[PDB]
Design a protein around this ligand. Structure first.
Ligand SMILES: N#Cc1cc2c(Oc3ccccc3OCCC(=O)NCC(F)F)cccn2c1
Lengths: 407, 546
């Protein structure tokens, strides 16, 4: 197999990212994993004249250890010229299918040799404990998983293998982000799960192994809910006027002038106020403008996506994906169900993973998260529930919400 | 001098080798220089060159701390050479070593000149000895001193040279570090002293001198500002100077020695001393000392009066860390496997953020400790913590951030960690309702604070030297002073609602501290927010008054 030559955007040097300190147990797994990989030829040890680095993590895919490499920085310095040169185009029909299964085709890439001159930028380090020894240094010889260039370069083979199945099933959508195939149908869950096993077998009998379901039918911007109460108070009309005043930044056709006169004198907080004719009229007129979606909100394929998450309590977290302030392209709420075997970081981690998949299905790119968590805390435990092969970008919003209940 | 395989080296892309002009220097040294070039050329570490593709680098000389020495300034070649992997930034921490009966410290001499230089790269190390007028034209064949590539290449060479000797002796353990090797073994002193002799004979077959046992160092070991003792470790003797005036420089060098000692001497406090350093001015001004700073330093002198020690690590024993409060936003921890001997100690201070509370600082301390245990021992400890389950369950349920709390057991040692108050989450029935507001003028900086209550009560207080921020908390403080043990405050300012709902128990502002004192006294407080200037009923009045 001849090698596809690979070039960074000119004036860009290779990545040099610090390796994160690891548990002894995790270091053992990497050294085991990497010893097998050196034998099968996939990676090789390197010298001190290779200055680049890329972090390595150890996750659990299971009772066996998978290795995960954080190619985020090397993706920015090469693939940004490989969304253009060898880019994989995104079908806007996939979000509209009733069911969507996700298949892991990451093994394919490991057969294909990597351009000899590019290998130096795949360098990574297995760290040692207590700086006992400079770590073990490796670089790749095959198409590495998690690099965004592996599926660009393997596209032609993948298009060829898939096409006999695309012919038999012209109504199935197959999309490839990184190391994963998204297959979306309109079949009944029974027939969808059949077709998927057909594709799994077609794939397996062409030499492509995969380990052995979403429904983007209720994926829209969830509407703002005004609490419906049988009786009201001074406090409840203050909470109501405060919410509607904030919504006026989103739906500018909201009038609160009628509800605010309804508590005219300085009155005790718990004092019960019945509402006038013009009050319920301002309440119901505002309920109809708040169940109908926004005007002017369009995906921009040049700006980044941004996902903000807020903690709600009792295993509930709500999220908002936008590109400009207040023009929310998508909103939702995620709830776990892991009893008392669920903790705050398990729940936030699954939230991030679920948000990133919805983002991939809808737009073919992942957001950058504004995460509510101490930075060092996240840099320590995120890998304990990370089941995915990609890694989104994130920063840490140490500023609190103060809003919360408004979502 | 070594048969080591060279490491290929390039120049930074689209650059070329250093072409500098040698300055005329005093002949007293020029002849002192050739007594080095010939005695180096005879050992092969350089070689004379002709006029072919000559770049040049300057060269100097100076006396000795008896034998004049040579200097080559590679500051220009260094700029043009490729980049290399970075040599070990950190070092092992003695808390983390595991005792090995016999330990031997070998320092290889001539280390960079024992290692050869990649052939096609030698021509860019060319340098020239002058005359009065021709000139001697040399170049290097080994890793030149103070070249950018020398440390990382030498480290890798040495590592490769050890590799066959380790594969024969899996019994013994070698730590590498700069030009030193530290060899430890659970071998009886005769087997150990024989193995060390095998090693030195191995290294000399690759061209690497090592000291003879007449020169082998002996414990205690003074390494990287430590005292390494056969069963215990500690820092070097600390010396705190006694000066009348104190330079901004002088304060830096003291908070230095003090932080260093906190690894092992428990109790060191460094808050007030670096509060003085918050001047951030340049480094000769004589900063005056405060009384609290003068007290803290006194207390540190009383810890440092006696000497204290640390044990080494034992992988068969559990890892336990303990945390105790010191009140001033200052926390302290000891890490031990045995209750009379610590592995190490240390402190944590929340010098980030203007308002905080104790539980959040406790959590941040647990976090510092977990990062550090991973670095040093490859695991996390079991925590002995001065706080109770019902306290912590309550805070991390009601917190906005996600938090991760390891298994911990409650050690009942005062001062404990508690929640000193909690805001009500729904308005209090049968409590007055204060509609506070406040306002100030950005130029005059006069402003005012007042409230209006549902019971017809009304106050207004004038302020001087304030801000819309100060006077908005001043309104709330006013409603607290003037009310029952249960009170319903209603405010229009997001800033003031932000501080309070964070539920701090300590702050920089005395205003916020006074508000905290009032909230601890109250028996129930409900705080509530309404949009400012939205004619809601209640605020409108205050705004007028204020
Ligand atoms: N000058 C100097 C010097 C010596 C060492 C050092 O010693 C060791 C060398 C090999 C294996 C284990 C070692 O320590 C185990 C605990 C122990 O007992 N150490 C020696 C003390 F008891 F003397 C380790 C790290 C840096 N060093 C710097």
């Amino acid at each position: 197999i001849e090698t596809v030559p690979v070039k960074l955007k000119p004036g860009m040097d290779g990545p040099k990212v610090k390796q994160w300190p690891l548990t002894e147990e995790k270091i053992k797994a990497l050294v085991e994993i990497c010893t097998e990989m050196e034998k099968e030829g996939k990676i090789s040890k390197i010298g001190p004249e290779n200055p680049y680095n890329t972090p390595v993590f150890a996750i659990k895919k299971s009772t066996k250890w998978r290795k995960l490499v954080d190619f985020r920085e090397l993706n920015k310095r090469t693939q940004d010229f490989w969304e253009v040169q060898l880019g994989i185009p995104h079908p806007a029909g996939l979000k509209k299918k009733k069911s969507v299964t996700v298949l892991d085709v990451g093994d394919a890439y490991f057969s294909v040799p990597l351009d000899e001159d590019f290998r130096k930028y795949t360098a990574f380090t297995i760290p040692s404990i207590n700086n006992e020894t400079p770590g073990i240094r490796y670089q790749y010889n095959v198409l590495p998983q998690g690099w965004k260039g592996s599926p660009a370069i393997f596209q032609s083979s993948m298009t060829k293998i898939l096409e006999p199945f695309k012919k038999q099933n012209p109504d199935i959508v197959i999309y490839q982000y990184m190391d994963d195939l998204y297959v979306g149908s309109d079949l009944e869950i029974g027939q969808h799960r059949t077709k998927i096993e057909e594709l799994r077998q077609h794939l397996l009998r062409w030499g492509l192994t995969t380990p052995d379901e979403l429904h983007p039918d209720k994926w829209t911007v969830q509407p703002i809910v005004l609490p419906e109460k049988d009786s009201w108070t001074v406090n409840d009309i203050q909470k109501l006027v405060g919410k509607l005043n904030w919504a006026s930044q989103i739906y500018p056709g909201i009038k609160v002038r009628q509800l605010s006169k309804l508590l005219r004198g300085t009155k005790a907080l718990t004092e019960v106020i019945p509402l006038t004719e013009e009050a319920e009229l301002e309440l119901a007129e505002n309920r109809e403008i708040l169940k109908e979606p926004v005007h002017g909100v369009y995906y921009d394929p040049s700006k980044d996506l941004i996902a903000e998450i807020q903690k709600q309590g009792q295993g509930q977290w709500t999220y908002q994906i936008y590109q400009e302030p207040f023009k929310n392209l998508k909103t939702g709420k995620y709830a776990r169900m892991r009893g008392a075997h669920t903790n705050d970081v398990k729940q936030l981690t699954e939230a991030v993973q679920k948000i990133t998949t919805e983002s991939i299905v809808i737009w073919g790119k992942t957001p950058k998260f504004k995460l509510p968590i101490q930075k060092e805390t996240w840099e320590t435990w995120w890998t304990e529930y990370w089941q995915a092969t990609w890694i989104p970008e994130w920063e840490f919003v140490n500023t609190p919400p103060l809003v919360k209940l408004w979502y | 001098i070594s048969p080591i395989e060279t490491v290929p080296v390039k120049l930074k892309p689209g650059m070329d080798g250093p072409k500098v002009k040698q300055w005329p220097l005093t002949e007293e040294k020029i002849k002192a220089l050739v007594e080095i070039c010939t005695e180096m050329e005879k050992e092969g570490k350089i070689s004379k060159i002709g006029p072919e593709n000559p770049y040049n680098t300057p060269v100097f000389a100076i006396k000795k701390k008896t034998k004049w020495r040579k200097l080559v300034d590679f500051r220009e070649l260094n700029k043009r050479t490729q980049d290399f992997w970075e040599v070990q930034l950190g070092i092992p921490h003695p808390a983390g070593l595991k005792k090995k009966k016999s330990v031997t410290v070998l320092d290889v001499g001539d280390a960079y000149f024992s290692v050869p230089l990649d052939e096609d790269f030698r021509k860019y190390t060319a340098f020239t000895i002058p005359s009065i007028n021709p000139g001697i034209r040399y170049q290097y064949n080994v890793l030149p001193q103070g070249w950018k590539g020398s440390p990382a290449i030498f480290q890798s060479s040495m590592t490769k040279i050890l590799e066959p000797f380790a594969a024969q002796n899996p019994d013994i353990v070698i730590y590498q570090y700069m030009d030193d090797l530290y060899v430890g073994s659970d071998l009886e002193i005769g087997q150990h002293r024989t193995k060390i002799e095998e090693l030195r004979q191995h290294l000399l077959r690759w061209g690497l001198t090592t000291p003879d046992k007449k020169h082998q160092k002996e414990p205690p070991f003074l390494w990287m500002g430590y005292e390494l003792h056969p069963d215990k470790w500690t820092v070097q003797p600390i010396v705190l100077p006694e000066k009348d005036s104190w330079t901004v420089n002088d304060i830096q060098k003291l908070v230095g020695k003090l932080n260093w000692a906190s690894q092992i001497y428990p109790g060191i406090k460094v808050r007030q001393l670096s509060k003085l350093l918050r001047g951030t001015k340049a480094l000769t001004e004589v900063i005056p000392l405060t009384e609290e700073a003068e007290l803290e330093l006194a207390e540190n002198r009383e810890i440092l009066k006696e000497p204290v020690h640390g044990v080494y690590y034992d992988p068969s024993k559990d890892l336990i860390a303990e945390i105790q409060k010191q009140g001033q936003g200052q926390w302290t921890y000891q890490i031990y496997q045995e209750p009379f001997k610590n592995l190490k100690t240390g402190k944590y201070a929340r010098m980030r953020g203007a308002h905080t509370n104790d539980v959040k600082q406790l959590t941040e301390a647990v976090q510092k400790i977990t990062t550090e245990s991973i670095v040093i021992w490859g695991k996390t400890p079991k925590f002995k913590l001065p706080i109770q389950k019902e306290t912590w369950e309550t805070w991390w349920t009601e917190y906005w951030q996600a938090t991760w709390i390891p298994e911990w057991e409650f050690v009942n040692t005062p001062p404990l960690v508690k929640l000193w108050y909690q805001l009500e989450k729904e308005p209090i029935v049968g409590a007055e309702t204060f509609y506070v507001d406040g306002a100030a003028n950005r130029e005059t900086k006069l402003g005012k604070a007042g409230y209006v209550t549902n019971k017809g009560r009304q106050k207004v207080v004038p302020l001087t030297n304030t801000t819309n921020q100060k006077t908005e908390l001043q309104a709330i403080y006013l409603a607290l002073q003037d009310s029952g043990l249960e009170v319903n405050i209603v405010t229009d300012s997001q800033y003031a609602l932000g501080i309070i709902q964070a539920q701090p128990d300590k702050s920089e502002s005395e205003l916020v501290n006074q508000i905290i004192e009032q909230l601890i006294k109250k028996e129930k407080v409900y705080l509530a927010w309404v949009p400012a200037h939205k004619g809601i009923g209640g605020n409108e009045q205050v705004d007028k008054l204020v």
